[model samples]
Target: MISVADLDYASRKSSIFLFAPHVGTFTKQSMDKLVRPLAASAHRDWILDTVAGLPTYWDALAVKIPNIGNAIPGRRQLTDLDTWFRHGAGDVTQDDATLPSIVVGPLVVLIQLTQYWRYLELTRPADLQADVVTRQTQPGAKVETLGFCAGLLAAVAVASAGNRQEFQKYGAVAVRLAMMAGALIDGQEARDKATRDGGSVSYAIAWRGQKPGEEAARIVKDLNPNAYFAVLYDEARATVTTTRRTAPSLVNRLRAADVTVAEIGIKGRIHSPDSERKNNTDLLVDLCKSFEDLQYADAASLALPTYNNEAEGRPVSRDRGNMTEMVIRAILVNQCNWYGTFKGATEGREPFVVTLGLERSVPPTLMRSLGPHQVHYEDLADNGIPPAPQ
Candidate 1:
């Protein structure tokens, strides 16, 4: 329920602010494209066909979103087509066990469209380039229909984040907008189904013709060239950990294709939250290591207290110390605007170094260049609080 120009304006206002169109915002052209395919397969379950045709569906609606190339320099454009391929887009014929190769065609086209839209946003000036507005609707629209949109948005957002220019704010907002639209679209569908007599229950939108599998392959080849999208699965055929869990041979195979696998891990907020947590809490951890040294803390490893052992089964209040310490660290490190350092007089054995407690928005290159112990400072005080003299 948006447009490229609308997206442009919304993005200008910090990308977080979103504006959804009125319920009657859909156009005849938009409706025709989606409904035409359903008309062809009217005898059979047309929703399935519409589901499989999301690439064309969204593309037609968002055709004016612009199509651009890799303009941003020094950034590798790696698309995670595997994730889409592994878990089918909307082609319900796909079962959990086998890979949904049929949906790949639609997904690839959608990826190209998403990439194009993102590029327009990324490269366009702060002002509106084109003032275009556009418009999802109902039960046959299906939950997975919203899901497909979400998945594409996720891809776009992650791709935006991974870009060197750092479009995290825009990407972050895109995610929120897409998710919010999900709720709105669903609500609209329910209202229509409930109120209108013989009203369109299906929100299935699609283009006129079917996308060919060959075109999908061509697009994949054109975009990634020699890159081969691969994922490792366990006995149950579920994906293993991150792409890192794949064997060295897998990397070798991808290298033969000249595609790098590490980029997948580096993109997105995959590790940023945990990275901040680890950097702040752990004293022995090294933040100056190479990208390869990165290891995200798994959810299973983190343990919270089960009982209030200190307060006789009472509910424990939340700890703000970590939050305050994190704020301080962000100011010192992320802003990279520190003037100097000072050591509060203490009866500690540690000697204060030149830049002790100095946080700077360390660039990736410079962060890796430093020695392991260069910035080590463990004696820094935590958020001020008293510990019992035990």
Candidate 2:
């Protein structure tokens, strides 16, 4: 549905604006040679493999849409992937509610999901350069995906709040233009079994012929000569909670469905521990290691090796983080039937109300980072309503 160059441009915009501030150093020489096309291809591969059939997960997590107050099996819900792109791009009514709303709300519905996407990397209690999440996605594609999504959410919310007419005008064609990205890949999800297409996921397997068991070892060896991808694939316990449920009911859901128990096959564009920049010989040599004592079954803990315990610092996609922040900024700044914080004071606590709602549902620790308790106090007295009751 999107092109590599488009993803490249979107990612570049995201990288320059989002990364330059935090990245200690970067080299275009290495990026073009070891990163660019590699990161783009890798991201495209990962997304198509993971994204297409996601509504199954979403349905399990979504309790109900609050606006309509009921869950409609297929209606008023995030449909299969194509529809998410098609309808969400714009068909008015149902789709419009999805944008900023889903971008803003889904994380709250499935709190652990943000963790799966690696939110903790950003909010880690201590300053650390590497983790399991960092190794899963490459730094080249990481911020690019993050930037595209963050910019996407902000652009949509800002435009919609400012002009309903434009929001309506912004349809499939308009959105496709903005689809600049690095998360490139091809896959398809059939709407139903009536078509009996079953569905398909096609990705250029990085380690094409390796057994699932051996792939972990191969990838780790590639990243760091002495590192081991110690992923345990045992049946693990699981939990799924809901908002409609009270505290007691919150603890009621449980299952052990085909749970993934290890971290062996995730492929992110992490800068290897090799050159401290790009070039993949030892990018994650931390995961690579002296396997002279190779015993895959006995592998327990993962120790990503760094020459001096300092990686070039490959990045994981922080787009989810960007998305959350943008949503908050949009809500806090564009409330009073207008746009901009300095543009004007948004009088109602509706701004606070919206942000606070999601904030309350998430963990207190996460709440501090995600929404950050922003208050848009235009003035209750001037707005002709109750004062500072917020």
Q: Compute the lDDT for candidate 1.
A: 0.23
Q: How close is candidate 1 to the true structure, as a TM-score?
A: 0.18
TM-score of every model?
0.18, 0.19
Q: How close to the true structure is residue 68 of candidate 1, measured as C-alpha lDDT?
A: 12
Model 1 error, position 263 (Å):
44
- Which ranges in model 2 have alpha carbons more than 4 Å from their true place? 1-157, 171-174, 177-183, 187-364, 368-390
Per-residue accuracy of model 1 over 112-206 as CA lDDT, tens digit each: 22332333343344311121110001211100100011222332222223232223332323322232222222222223335422112111011
Write down the lDDT that model 2 would get: 0.21
**How many residue pairs collide in each prediction?**
5, 32
Worst 10 residues of 2 by lDDT: 180-189
Deviation of model 1 at 259, angstroms: 54
